[PDB]
């Protein structure tokens, strides 16, 4: 009801698995706001943001040759096996070495292509030392069949390291085009695998069936969703904005994480008692806003580049695509209206639709209502295009 509750209350609308900050740290903050420690209150918030931003993710991807490591690594990086920078390493092995692949627009996220353990005379242990297992947040164990012994021995060596690991069963689509002229045809895969684990002295483990081709029609949505949950809270935000924008819910989950960061930021910069109006912009604020808009656009796959490589796929004109959404106009110069008049209208619209988000007479600075507005605009666009991207399919 008062400010301290308003601050932590904002996070109530996000279930445990989608919080960008821990409930313990949140209470420690509300606590300081109540004890009257402006030092530690702005300090706490500030460190939580620094730790959230500076988080570096390192995903190890392992498995036999042709299991699907390259395509998985590319699918998460949101790029085609052909596109520039794609992890087009079928049977590299011109070096039985570990290969790193950064995320195109979201650095801090790095996938590692690990040479199958069966391509080296290294025992389950020696292998992970050379591969530097200690450098990874989690492991993606990929298998085409129903997993081999090697896969289990790796997991065992990994769990003995307190590290996370996930069993991903790829090529399911390539196993459906052999039973058509889905149903329990999946149970099969789900069974062979479960029988392999029950064959290597381990309880039944979670398994994620999926096709790199049909990027979002199986356990893929559940996996990505699970990776985020299992990640230490502070590591969530950076890996979440990097995931592929496959479903509305994925887009939405991204907005929810980003809404939370805008909130933490607004409070860090200090609340004000003057109603937002943007009567005077300021060049430093305009530059910040321009970067925020650019970032969000990248994250939701609606930036300039992404729109270009979307027109050639529809044989339409870039400008034609841009007209389909609203995010690209915001900073598009016009003789008819100033960027100030426009931004001013944005704030007014926003606050009339959402209120000020805080108790009476307390408001975030103008720049943050704007950042929320841009966030809504950009997520809607993503859902717009994505939607149109689904009509023109192959079925
Ligand atoms: N249908 C289908 N094909 C797939 C899938 N994944 C990989 N493929 C195909 O299988 C081949 C081998 O997969 P690839 O990505 O090279 O796996 P890899 O694990 O990296 N091989 P290596 O272990 O030797 O490095 C490629 O022809 C690719 O087109 C999939 O999920 N569905």
Curated annotation (Swiss-Prot):
Substitution effect: residue 95 to D = Abolishes GTPase activity. Reduces GTP-dependent oligomerization. Results in inefficient accumulation of protein at parasitophorous vacuole following infection with avirulent T.gondii strain; reduces accumulation of wild-type protein
Q: What is the effect of changing residue 70 to N?
A: Abrogates interaction with HOOK3. Greatly reduces binding affinity for GDP and GTP. Abolishes GTP-dependent oligomer formation
Effect listed in the UniProt record for changing residue 193 to R = Blocks T.gondii ROP5 binding
Instruction: Tell me where it resides.
Output: Cytoplasm; Nucleus membrane; Endoplasmic reticulum membrane; Golgi apparatus, Golgi stack membrane
Gene Ontology biological process: cellular response to interferon-beta; cytokine-mediated signaling pathway; defense response to Gram-negative bacterium; defense response to protozoan; innate immune response; regulation of autophagy; response to bacterium
What happens when you mutate residue 151 to A? Blocks T.gondii ROP5 binding
Provide the positions where the record notes the PTM (Microbial infection) Phosphothreonine.
89, 95
Instruction: Note the effect listed for residue 89 to A.
Output: Abolishes interaction with T.gondii GRA7. Abolishes GTPase activity. Reduces GTP-dependent oligomerization
Annotated phenotype, changing residue 69 to A: Constitutively active. Binds GTP but fails to hydrolyze it. Does not localize to the parasitophorous vacuole membrane following T.gondii infection
What upregulates or represses it? Answer: Up-regulated by IFNG, IFNA1 and lipopolysaccharide (LPS) within 20 hours. Transiently up-regulated during the early stages of infection by Listeria monocytogenes. After 6 days expression is back to basal levels.
The IRG-type G domain sits at 55-230
Substitution effect: residue 148 to E: Blocks T.gondii ROP5 binding
Enumerate the UniProt keywords alphabetically. Answer: Cytoplasm, Disulfide bond, Endoplasmic reticulum, Golgi apparatus, GTP-binding, Hydrolase, Immunity, Innate immunity, Lipoprotein, Membrane, Myristate, Nucleotide-binding, Nucleus, Phosphoprotein
What is the E.C. number? 3.6.5.-
- Disulfide cysteine pairs (residue numbers): 216-390
Q: Which family does it belong to?
A: Belongs to the TRAFAC class dynamin-like GTPase superfamily. IRG family.
Q: What does this protein do?
A: GTPase with low activity. Has higher affinity for GDP than for GTP. Plays a role in resistance to intracellular pathogens. During infection with avirulent Toxoplasma gondii strains, recruited to the parasitophorous vacuole membrane. Required for disruption of the parasitophorous vacuole formed following T.gondii infection and subsequent killing of the parasite. Mediates resistance to Chlamydia trachomatis infection by targeting bacterial inclusions to autophagosomes for subsequent lysosomal destruction.
Could you give the subunit structure recorded for this chain? Answer: Monomer, as apoenzyme and in the GDP-bound form. Homooligomer, upon GTP binding. Interacts with HOOK3.
Q: What is this protein called?
A: Interferon-inducible GTPase 1
Give the organism the record lists: Mus musculus
- The gene name reads Iigp1
